[PDB]
Amino acid sequence: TGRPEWIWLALGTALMGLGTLYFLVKGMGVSDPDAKKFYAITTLVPAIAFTMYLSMLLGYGLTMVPFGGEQNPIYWARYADWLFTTPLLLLDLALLVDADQGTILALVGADGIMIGTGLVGALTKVYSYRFVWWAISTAAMLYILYVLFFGFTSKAESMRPEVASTFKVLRNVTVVLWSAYPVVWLIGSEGAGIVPLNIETLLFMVLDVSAKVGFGLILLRSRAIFGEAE
Amino acid sequence: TGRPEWIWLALGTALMGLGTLYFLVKGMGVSDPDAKKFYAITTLVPAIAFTMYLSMLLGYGLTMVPFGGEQNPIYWARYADWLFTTPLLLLDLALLVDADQGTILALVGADGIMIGTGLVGALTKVYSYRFVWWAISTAAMLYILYVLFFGFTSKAESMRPEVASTFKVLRNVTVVLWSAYPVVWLIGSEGAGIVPLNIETLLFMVLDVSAKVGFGLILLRSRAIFGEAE
Amino acid sequence: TGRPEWIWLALGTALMGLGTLYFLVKGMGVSDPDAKKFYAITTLVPAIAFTMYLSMLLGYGLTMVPFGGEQNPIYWARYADWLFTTPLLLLDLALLVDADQGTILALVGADGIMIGTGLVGALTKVYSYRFVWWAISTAAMLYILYVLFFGFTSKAESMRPEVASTFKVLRNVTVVLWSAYPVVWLIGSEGAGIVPLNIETLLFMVLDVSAKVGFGLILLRSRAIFGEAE
Ligand SMILES: CC(C)CCC[C@@H](C)CCC[C@@H](C)CCC[C@@H](C)CCO[C@@H](CO)COCC[C@@H](C)CCC[C@H](C)CCC[C@@H](C)CCCC(C)C
Ligand SMILES: CC(C)CCC[C@@H](C)CCC[C@@H](C)CCC[C@@H](C)CCO[C@@H](CO)COCC[C@@H](C)CCC[C@H](C)CCC[C@@H](C)CCCC(C)C
Ligand SMILES: CC(C)CCC[C@@H](C)CCC[C@@H](C)CCC[C@@H](C)CCO[C@@H](CO)COCC[C@@H](C)CCC[C@H](C)CCC[C@@H](C)CCCC(C)C
Ligand SMILES: CC(C)CCC[C@@H](C)CCC[C@H](C)CCC[C@@H](C)CCO[C@@H](CO)COCC[C@H](C)CCC[C@@H](C)CCC[C@@H](C)CCCC(C)C
Ligand SMILES: CC(C)CCC[C@@H](C)CCC[C@H](C)CCC[C@@H](C)CCO[C@@H](CO)COCC[C@H](C)CCC[C@@H](C)CCC[C@@H](C)CCCC(C)C
Ligand SMILES: CC(C)CCC[C@@H](C)CCC[C@H](C)CCC[C@@H](C)CCO[C@@H](CO)COCC[C@H](C)CCC[C@@H](C)CCC[C@@H](C)CCCC(C)C
Ligand SMILES: *C/C=C(C)/C=C/C=C(C)/C=C/C1=C(C)CCCC1(C)C
Ligand SMILES: *C/C=C(C)/C=C/C=C(C)/C=C/C1=C(C)CCCC1(C)C
Ligand SMILES: *C/C=C(C)/C=C/C=C(C)/C=C/C1=C(C)CCCC1(C)C
């Protein structure tokens, strides 16, 4: 309770934990192989986030980085979360549209570059260089957003309407929520330091629960996750 | 030789190295694609363990963690081993039964959570919180054990008898040996400290060689690893 | 500019960045799923290397390792690069020949052992033991080279001539360039220290740009990356 942001770390831990349990229960019983892949992906995402929220809450996932002459509290565990959960979210989208394997590779690899350069920026001790990593990471994010909108152009032919509809909704959820993360980091504790860590943590908690549990609720309620069967 | 547990680290290095060489030789010549996947998986497992045993033996894979007011010797290299070798062992089981891809994802991701939360527990400086990570990791292990027993329920129909027989044996080997690891950690150097590090290292060496080389000997001697062919 | 090797780190950053941009543009428009996988793999390789070259240039990817009684500058970011880019290069080769999945596993796992034991050697504080890790890593490299020459022996039957021709060329490029890396490390800053870090950095920059951008130019100009189509 000693860090003011504890309350949002606690709330994020609880909501990710409850979302995980909900999705775990919800997928109990499903047999359809296509649906099993979406439940597995979609349940792992908040499970991983639960563990990394808890590590921040307990202090394990926090480190001090000197930059600006100051000792700056940097929650590194966010990058260990996102390293796994953001490619998993992209895989859910990619599987929905039956993406080609080359496209999945491009997406997962650009996402790794996005998170790994964000982690390097988050831990860089020369203040000005932190924003160079932010820019490179943002370029990788823009590439991902580009592929999500313009990289499935051969798939439209042979896409079930309900898959098309659930994919468009989740793609729009993804583009809006993910695009807010570079802005929060830029103005927050890792970047310019104009928004305090307390509020930054709240913002990422709202984004994360929305991008993982809210995304997952929309996907897992959809018929698009089942193969078409008589 | 300065740490009493060196002898078990040396013995573990040698047995993993010899098991690797044996499996490498044994799979020389196999053409069958199914069998090649099992030899590859099963040979990599003790090869990786050989390197991490050697890193503990040479001291690289040891760190001191303050907790309990004391400086506690924690062999972190075990988690770098298990991060790769325990999903590989699960993949051998999963391939045997032709598991659905969603099930393999669930298994590999729960296993990553199990090892990563065990690593966080192993390095946590607040003593009481180490057991919170142990509990979460144990929950993930129990999920894996649950899936190995109740998650292949559509596969029984179309399973060759020899695959069914080798899978049941290896599944039983896996459930018994893996379940001992949380107990050893709980009573050993990472947990309550009731069993000294010397004996703990012996116990994990016996478990590891059994779970990797003993498992691999049973699998690789089986006809279940070959596709059925005239 | 304070470290004499900065100029090769700068040149390597620029050439990897320009190679990435070139391959990104070059693959704009390709529809063929086979070709998309090769463009994705082959574009990610210099993109990742660009980020790790930049991290060395900016100092983030450098650490000091005590060994020999001295504080030795070790660029660890090379291992974070190679951890991802060397399996990706192997995947390009493997996909060219339609390798069996067991063979791809063997290659990617031996490559992980090669890079992870090279990283352990690079950070080991007992000088003599650094060469033990070098030897183990070299054994893994020799295994990979062995598989590239003798592990596709069932694939020769059903291999298009242009795939066979591009694969032989890239395989020869790979064996020659990769084999130089253990020699550079052995005589350079990480090993015996007979070649200064400045020259070592130049050597790895020439190898890396050749093994990534030069390799990629040969592959991506080939018809072998397209499925055979009327
Ligand atoms: C899915 C859910 C039930 C998760 C609920 C949210 C939760 C994890 C975080 C909320 C913290 C909350 C209790 C706030 C008040 C603090 C308080 C207790 C007293 C203050 O008092 C103080 C004074 O400084 C702090 O106490 C010590 C530390 C604790 C407060 C933190 C404990 C860790 C957690 C509560 C989480 C435990 C994880 C488990 C789910 C493990 C089981 C795994 C498995 C079976 C799948
Ligand atoms: C597959 C096998 C042959 C492995 C055999 C077991 C072994 C790796 C560990 C046993 C240690 C043992 C010799 C005990 C006595 C110590 C002693 C030498 C003297 C004591 O004297 C002392 C005094 O404190 C310590 O010596 C210095 C360190 C060494 C003892 C340790 C050296 C490392 C290893 C012996 C392993 C080397 C790895 C290789 C396989 C590399 C090749 C890779 C490739 C070709 C695939
Ligand atoms: C693809 C290319 C355009 C890459 C070009 C090469 C380059 C990255 C490295 C060359 C350094 C060079 C300018 C040498 C002179 C130094 C100098 C400026 C003055 C010396 O003056 C000094 C005194 O000590 C140092 O300056 C401070 C640091 C900088 C010199 C380094 C800045 C980082 C880089 C220049 C790279 C930026 C990365 C971007 C591509 C981000 C955008 C991502 C996205 C849109 C895809
Ligand atoms: C968020 C992101 C930036 C992260 C992206 C990925 C990331 C984790 C990068 C990792 C690269 C690298 C380790 C960097 C080190 C930095 C540093 C300063 C020191 C680190 O930290 C230290 C300091 O004490 C220890 O590291 C050395 C040991 C290793 C970390 C573990 C060794 C592993 C092996 C030798 C075993 C072989 C593994 C394989 C077989 C894997 C293949 C799987 C297969 C079987 C299919
Ligand atoms: C046992 C477990 C807990 C481990 C589970 C996974 C694990 C390794 C978690 C890693 C997350 C994270 C790095 C945590 C950092 C903690 C910390 C305090 C600081 C670390 O350690 C430090 C301290 O000096 C350095 O880290 C920063 C640099 C990075 C480690 C490496 C950067 C990688 C990239 C920028 C390149 C892009 C990579 C991708 C392209 C990968 C995608 C593959 C593709 C091409 C298909
Ligand atoms: C170049 C090579 C040697 C590297 C090869 C791989 C490598 C990165 C090895 C990593 C092992 C290990 C982390 C070693 C730690 C060393 C040390 C001294 C301390 C480190 O560094 C520290 C010091 O502060 C922090 O580490 C602990 C936290 C973790 C690093 C991150 C935890 C991750 C999780 C708990 C979440 C679960 C992840 C999974 C779900 C992944 C599965 C994917 C799925 C969903 C499909
Ligand atoms: C589950 C959490 C999700 C969906 C997180 C998304 C994170 C991002 C899109 C992060 C992007 C970043 C940048 C583009 C620039 C650097 C800072 C980051 C890593 C916050
Ligand atoms: C090759 C080595 C094998 C099979 C290792 C298995 C390791 C485990 C099943 C570890 C489990 C753990 C817990 C469930 C709780 C926390 C402590 C661990 C990581 C030892
Ligand atoms: C893109 C960069 C490439 C192709 C790098 C290749 C790196 C190697 C083949 C590294 C090999 C090493 C050894 C065999 C011994 C230990 C030192 C290393 C890691 C340099």
Author numbering:
A (entry chain A), B (entry chain A), C (entry chain A): 5 to 234
Copied sentences from the primary study:
In the case of bR, the retinal chromophore forms a Schiff-base (SB) linkage with a lysine residue at position 216 (Lys216). The light absorption causes the isomerization of a double bond at C13−C14 of retinal from a trans to cis conformation.
Diffraction data from a crystal including the K intermediate at ~1.3 Å were collected at 15 K with an absorbed dose of 0.05 MGy. The average I/σ(I) value for the highest shell (1.42–1.33 Å) was a sufficiently high value of ~1.4, when the resolution limit was determined as a shell with CC1/2 of ~0.5. As for the ground state, X-ray diffraction data from crystal I and II were measured after the activation with green laser and subsequent restoration with red laser, whereas data from crystal III were measured before the activation. This implies that the process of activation does not affect the ground state structure. On the other hand, the distance between Asp212 and W402 is shortened to 3.08 Å, although the distance in the ground state is 3.40 Å.
